[PDB]
Amino acid sequence: KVFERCELARTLKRLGMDGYRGISLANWMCLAKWESGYNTRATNYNAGDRSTDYGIFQINSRYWCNDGKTPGALNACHLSCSALLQDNIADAVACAKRVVRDPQGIRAWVAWRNRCQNRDVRQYVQGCGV
């Protein structure tokens, strides 16, 4: 499913993402936007290390979910990577929360640092009723 901007904003809010570990809803929107264009079916194989990024937040199989084909991978969110490909983002949101509970917080995603950190992200939630 490819979410519409405000549709996603309210969906994330209902899921408890607004201010989760100090991260605003606009930051999460900027992340999802740059990671997958709000596409839950998005995937990216990394030939260099044999891992794959899954879903709307492009979560990596080396540490967060199990796909059975990533060498010596971990599964910190304790989910099949398949769970990160559902139209319903509840499992993806649970996993994203798990990622940010670690030291780096939202910085765990390099794309967030590149296109959201120290940027004006107000535009991502304006007019969404959040």
Side-chain angles (χ1 to χ4, degrees):
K1 168 186 182 178
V2 183
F3 279 84
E4 297 273 61
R5 180 179 67 95
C6 292
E7 176 194 13
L8 179 60
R10 291 184 292 274
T11 303
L12 289 171
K13 193 170 172 187
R14 287 195 303 270
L15 293 172
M17 294 287 256
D18 196 3
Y20 185 78
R21 292 299 152 102
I23 307 162
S24 70
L25 199 63
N27 273 290
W28 289 121
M29 289 292 293
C30 182
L31 173 65
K33 169 69 186 181
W34 287 102
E35 286 297 349
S36 63
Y38 309 142
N39 178 15
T40 64
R41 279 194 58 245
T43 52
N44 170 53
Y45 179 62
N46 303 290
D49 82 322
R50 300 189 170 169
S51 70
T52 307
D53 302 314
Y54 293 90
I56 197 170
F57 295 122
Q58 284 295 272
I59 292 168
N60 191 267
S61 61
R62 173 146 302 294
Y63 311 94
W64 312 104
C65 64
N66 183 40
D67 61 2
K69 60 176 177 185
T70 309
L74 302 184
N75 179 14
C77 296
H78 298 98
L79 292 166
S80 163
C81 295
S82 177
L84 305 182
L85 295 179
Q86 302 174 81
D87 276 13
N88 184 281
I89 63 173
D91 286 337
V93 159
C95 188
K97 287 175 184 185
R98 170 59 183 87
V99 176
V100 310
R101 288 198 290 273
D102 276 0
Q104 287 186 291
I106 190 77
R107 286 157 166 81
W109 286 271
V110 178
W112 181 87
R113 306 176 214 173
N114 297 336
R115 318 204 179 225
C116 309
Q117 180 178 195
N118 305 153
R119 301 273 197 162
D120 182 335
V121 293
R122 289 180 288 152
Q123 63 178 303
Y124 291 109
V125 293
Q126 303 313 257
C128 300
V130 299

